Amino acid sequence: EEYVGPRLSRRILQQARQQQEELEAEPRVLEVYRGVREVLSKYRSGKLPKAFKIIPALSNWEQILYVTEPEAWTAAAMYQATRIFASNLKERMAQRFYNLVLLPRVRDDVAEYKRLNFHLYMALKKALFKPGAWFKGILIPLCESGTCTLREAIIVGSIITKCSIPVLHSSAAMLKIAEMEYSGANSIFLRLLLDKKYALPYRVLDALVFHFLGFRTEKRELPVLWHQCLLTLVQRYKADLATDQKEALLELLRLQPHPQLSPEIRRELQSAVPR
Amino acid sequence: SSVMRRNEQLTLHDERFEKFYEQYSNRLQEVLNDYYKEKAENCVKLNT
Amino acid sequence: EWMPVTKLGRLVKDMKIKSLEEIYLFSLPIKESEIIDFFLGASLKDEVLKIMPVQKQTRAGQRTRFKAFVAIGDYNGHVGLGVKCSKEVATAIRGAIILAKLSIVPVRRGYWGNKIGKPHTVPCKVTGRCGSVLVRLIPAPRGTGIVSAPVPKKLLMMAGIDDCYTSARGCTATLGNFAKATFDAISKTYSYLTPDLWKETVFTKSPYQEFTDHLVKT
Amino acid sequence: AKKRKKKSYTTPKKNKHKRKKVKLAVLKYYRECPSDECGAGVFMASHFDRHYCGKCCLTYC
RNA sequence: AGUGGAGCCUGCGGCUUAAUUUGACCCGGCCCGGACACGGACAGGAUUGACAGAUUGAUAGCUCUUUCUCGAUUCCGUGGGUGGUGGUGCAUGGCCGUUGUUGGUGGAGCGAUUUGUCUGGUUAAUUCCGAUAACGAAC
Ligand SMILES: [Zn+2]
Structure with a gap:
């Protein structure tokens, strides 16, 4: 060995310096809402504190809600919050809550767990207790995002199929779907709205025919979901199709055919009675 | 608005679309003191 | 390329x-x-x-x-x-x-009887041998077609032979020997010396010797 | 593939509770809530001792 | 130096157990469990939400007194040659970045096969020195 090393030599130089030196010598609502914020972070069941149940009656409700930290909530707490906000009117407030809290959670955990929790499924049904805030708050924003996947589409569309929808609200949702630019998940929602078999306003029917006829010149290959949506449209609403629209649909089938589904659509279109 | 239209036979409802696309204290203190009372009431440690 | x-x-x-x-x-x-x-x-x-x-x-x-x-x-x-x-x-x-x-x-193609038209059959009966498989080709009249087993049938039709009588001996079930035997017979079509090929050969210059100057440049 | 038998085993779930139906309860209205929003319209329900709200849940004596 | 002997601890078998979770388990108890069709009820309210008090092992407005508000967002039976937030198998496609083993060609054999892939020295080694019907390669 020729060199001492770092630590031992550091101790040696400090020791030598020391020996040389010694020889030289000779308000209050915030606390409540924070506490119920920790309560809602671990909630499983039972009754909520009454401070949580008077949130929709407040004026500065948003600041209280950010204090309650909704992104850290549990699923049962969010289901009960959905029930509370659906109970106390003010459709704009419910719409903004669904925009801000509910749909971000659904999009977060469907992307993570690949399936929806039980409590959140009942939460979207209870949010559907007020349908106008649902359509403007979750459905149309999810379709306008453009990033909606197939699994989100199937889950939310199944929630739509479970419940009975007002005809005006369903028709408005269908028209906003129809005028929208195409996405693969969009035809699923459109089909599940057509499966409700309500009376259909005629401007919505014209928009649907125009949308499917806007698919006339597209070179993009279509999935089988689009064909099944068109098949549902023809199967349920062949009675109120004009002959011009009928021949246009036949032309669309000629330009965009399917080996299996297209002959069935031709059979239903060729056996249709008007008015 | 599209081109081809319902042709014939009646309209039952006109439908309202101009609401969808055209869209886009003492009591709290009482609730607070009730909350504090219940939070003290989970273990009271005094009653005999 | x-x-x-x-x-x-x-x-x-x-x-x-x-x-x-x-x-x-x-x-x-x-x-x-x-x-x-x-x-x-x-x-x-x-x-x-x-x-x-x-x-x-x-x-x-x-x-x-x-x-x-x-x-x-x-x-x-x-x-x-x-x-x-x-x-x-x-x-x-x-x-x-x-x-x-x-x-x-x-492959050399000949005539069965009279020499009218294009050659259609094998000029003389030839023989090809491969590992106990013996395959013989016999001249056939026009229109008789290839009368043979399927593997030499394919090889003889591909050769441009229109018609031929065939005979095979040995373990013909081993396919490589059978194919190689009929390939040997159709090579011996030009290896056979007939009175047609009796005039003395003139020797034309070989391509290596005809084009020596062109191969200088490479 | 091999199919299952599908056992029946009937269990009666018909006896489920439904809350009682009060018929034509508009007789007994004709206290009024002096609230911030639900004033002049909402009737203010009576116990044996004290009247409680049905929209905003206010506390009296 | 021990472990294997001893007391304790931990693991795996085994044994008990209602369960002693497994290469989450047990005993009870409330809640509801699809669309669609058919038949009922609903504006002479369908149904949500609800403060207090009494309950059962639970502060169960998911029950009784209080039935007050909420204005259709409907719930009650009958239904299956019905099923979908199902399970599984098959088939095929999207997102970043590039342009010791055995072949190829030649030699041997009808062929399976062989030579390459080796006398000697040397290396952990088809490595190397070199001999050679083989020569050149990729992992
Ligand atoms: Zn109340």
């Missing part, structure tokens, strides 16, 4: 050698398949006689390979026979096609 290596290939790549028969005249080896692609081209049909999967004994155990017997042939002219063993079936088939294309021989 073909870049020739042999002198014969470099002459064929130019317009120096006009026909394949010149290469057959001086008995030169064809060592590139692209020459045969050049001269015959779209005429060359190729028929897979057989694919047999085989098990190679490896130190790891046994592993599978494939053996392809492929007959290639320009009708009204030429055939070759190739066998290739390789790992996948596609590469074995293209290897056998190349190796069949490197073996292309000409």
Whole structure:
């Protein structure tokens, strides 16, 4: 060995310096809402504190809600919050809550767990207790995002199929779907709205025919979901199709055919009675 | 608005679309003191 | 893109050698398949006689390979026979096609009786032998067709023979020996000396000696 | 594939509770809530001792 | 130096157990469990939400007194040659970045096969020195 090393030599130089030196010598609502914020972070069941149940009656409700930290909530707490906000009117407030809290959670955990929790499924049904805030708050924003996947589409569309929808609200949702630019998940929602078999306003029917006829010149290959949506449209609403629209649909089938589904659509279109 | 239209036979409802696309204290203190009372009431440690 | 290596290939790549028969005249080896692609081209049909999967004994155990017997042939002219063993079936088939294309021989066609029209049959009864398999071709009249077993049927139809009587002896069930025997017989078609070929041969200059100055430049 | 038998085993779930139906309860209205929003319209329900709200849940004596 | 002997601890078998979760388990108890069709009820409210008190092992407005508000967002039976937030198998496609083993060609054999892949020296080694019907390669 020729060199001492770092630590031992550091101790040696400090020791030598020391020996040389010694020889030289000779308000209050915030606390409540924070506490119920920790309560809602671990909630499983039972009754909520009454401070949580008077949130929709407040004026500065948003600041209280950010204090309650909704992104850290549990699923049962969010289901009960959905029930509370659906109970106390003010459709704009419910719409903004669904925009801000509910749909971000659904999009977060469907992307993570690949399936929806039980409590959140009942939460979207209870949010559907007020349908106008649902359509403007979750459905149309999810379709306008453009990033909606197939699994989100199937889950939310199944929630739509479970419940009975007002005809005006369903028709408005269908028209906003129809005028929208195409996405693969969009035809699923459109089909599940057509499966409700309500009376259909005629401007919505014209928009649907125009949308499917806007698919006339597209070179993009279509999935089988689009064909099944068109098949549902023809199967349920062949009675109120004009002959011009009928021949246009036949032309669309000629330009965009399917080996299996297209002959069935031709059979239903060729056996249709008007008015 | 599209081109081809319902042709014939009646309209039952006109439908309202101009609401969808055209869209886009003492009591709290009482609730607070009730909350504090219940939070003290989970273990009271005094009653005999 | 073909870049020739042999002198014969470099002459064929130019317009120096006009026909394949010149290469057959001086008995030169064809060592590139692209020459045969050049001269015959779209005429060359190729028929897979057989694919047999085989098990190679490896130190790891046994592993599978494939053996392809492929007959290639320009009708009204030429055939070759190739066998290739390789790992996948596609590469074995293209290897056998190349190796069949490197073996292309000409066939002599004659007449049964009167010499009217094009030649249609084998000039004289020929014989091809491969590992106890003996295959004999006998001249047949016009319209009689190829009367033979299916594997020499394919090889003789590909040769441009229209009609032939055939006879086979030995273990004809082994397919490579049977195909190689009928390939031997159709090579001996031009190896046979007849009174038609009795005039003394004049010796034309070989392409290596005719085009020596063109091969200087490379 | 091999199919299962699908056992029946009937268990009666018909006896489920439903809350009682009060018929034509508009007789007994004709206290009014002096609230911020639900004033002049909402009737203010009576116990044996004290009247409680049905929209905003206010506390009296 | 021990472990294997001893007391304790921990693991795996085994044994008990209602369960002693497994290469989450047990005993009870409330809640509801699809669309669609058919038949009922609903504006002479369908149904949500609800402060207090009494309950059962639970502060169960998911029950009784209080039935007050909420205005269709409907719930009650009958239904299956019905099923979908199902399970599984098959088939095929999207997102970043590039342009010791055995072949190829030649030699031997009808062929399976062989040579390459080797006398000697040397290396952990088809490495190397070199001999050679082989020569050149990729992992
Ligand atoms: Zn109340």
